[PDB]
């Protein structure tokens, strides 16, 4: 337990955590200073840097698991970090599927450590995620409303305008868009009205509802304070 004890002192020491944090931030600046219009030996070097950082993070997380004998898996943030470092390490020696370079996305994902390996970010994000369930009821209600209105619209406005309402998916997308009040009249409703004149009666109540529901959401937040 002497070597184990030394290793644990190293892991829990603020020095080790700060070292990892600065290493992560440095890696973050490293990947960040990436301009895709390159295809320049720079791009290849980025992979090398990522390689080293991932190896070091594997070292760190192995030490963390050894120290937190299963205890860290119970902790969500530790499990999340183990998972992220795992995905980064996997993409490191595994290869992309030809059709779609999804794994380069797993390599870039690694950047989320800035929240998990950071305790202040960890605690604040934990506060906000503790807040959300109090509104999970409203989230589910609003999602159900989206589902219902989406099916109705797509079944109505499918003949022509398939891009916006051809199926349930584009219908969900376009309804979320409308909720945001982003080009909802000029690019969507008015072209629709050109063919289906009374489509307005559809969206205006919808707007009401969602905006109303969203204000209720803020009210719920003003309830927790």
């Amino acid at each position: 337990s002497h070597m184990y004890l030394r290793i644990t002192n190293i892991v829990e020491s603020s020095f080790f955590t700060k070292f990892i944090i600065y290493l992560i931030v440095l890696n973050t600046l490293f990947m960040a200073m990436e301009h895709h219009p390159m295809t320049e030996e720079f791009k290849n070097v980025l992979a090398i840097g990522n390689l080293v950082f991932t190896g070091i993070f594997a070292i760190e997380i192995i030490l963390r698991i050894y120290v937190h004998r299963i205890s860290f898996f119970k902790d969500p943030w530790s499990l999340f970090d183990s998972l992220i470092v795992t995905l980064s390490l996997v993409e490191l020696f595994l290869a992309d599927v030809e059709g779609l370079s999804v794994l380069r996305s797993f390599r870039l994902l690694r950047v989320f450590r800035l929240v998990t390996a950071v305790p202040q970010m960890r605690k604040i994000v934990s506060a906000l995620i503790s807040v959300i369930p109090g509104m999970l009821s409203v989230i589910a209600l609003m999602t159900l409303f989206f589902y219902i209105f989406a099916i109705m619209a797509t079944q109505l406005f499918g003949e022509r305008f398939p891009e916006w309402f051809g199926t349930l998916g584009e219908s969900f997308y376009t309804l979320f868009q409308v909720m945001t009040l982003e080009s909802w009249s000029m690019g969507i409703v008015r072209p629709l009205m050109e063919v289906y004149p009374y489509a307005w009666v559809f969206f205006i109540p919808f707007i009401f509802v969602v905006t109303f529901v969203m204000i209720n959401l803020v009210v719920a937040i003003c309830v927790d304070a």
């Binding site: 020696f93 595994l94 290869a95 992309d96």
Partner: peptide
């Protein structure tokens, strides 16, 4: 011959069957 798994690769030193070159030879999804 060819460059084995995890050995360096380039335009003239290609990866052995079943691998793809990304500075080093990686394995292609099964």
């Amino acid at each position: 011959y060819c460059q084995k798994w995890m050995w360096t690769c380039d335009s003239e030193r290609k990866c052995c069957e079943g691998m793809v070159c990304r500075l080093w030879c990686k394995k292609k999804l099964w």
